[PDB]
Design a protein around this ligand. Sequence first.
Ligand SMILES: *[C@@H]1O[C@H](CO)[C@@H](O)[C@H](O)[C@H]1NC(C)=O
Length: 160
Amino acid sequence: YGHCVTDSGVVYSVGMQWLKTQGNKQMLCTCLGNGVSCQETAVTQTYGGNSNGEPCVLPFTYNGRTFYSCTTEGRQDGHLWCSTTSNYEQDQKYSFCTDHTVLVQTRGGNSNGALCHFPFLYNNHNYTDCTSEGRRDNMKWCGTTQNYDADQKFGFCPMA
Ligand SMILES: *[C@@H]1O[C@H](CO)[C@@H](O)[C@H](O)[C@H]1NC(C)=O
């Protein structure tokens, strides 16, 4: 009942994102009722810029390099900027992203390689870090859904 299965046998409860592949690249897929939200894993909340509250259009080259996602090249406000036009040198459109979004990829336990959602609720407590609630061992974990305790699905965070 519910959840989504991709890759070959990887179940991902609703409101659950995860990394995948759609050819020669990786695509971001998430369980959402009965339609896995599969979409590139690039670009994020785009504000202001030469796009005026619009999405991006990667890849986008600039200065002589081919950026495949937001970048801080040129900007000094802290956030990253992205081009909103396949041909940056053409449209010259762009947009300032927000903290280059955030997508965690936990694994082991239950969230079989599930793109942990940060932040993540816990027992009704806004959490923004691989919490070890009930751990006590060298290792942290987070919630695969905005409502962990409400989703009953956790996963270990990267070790690198
Ligand atoms: C957790 O944070 C979100 C927005 O960050 C808010 O809508 C939600 O109500 C918060 N949950 C609790 C239990 O405070």
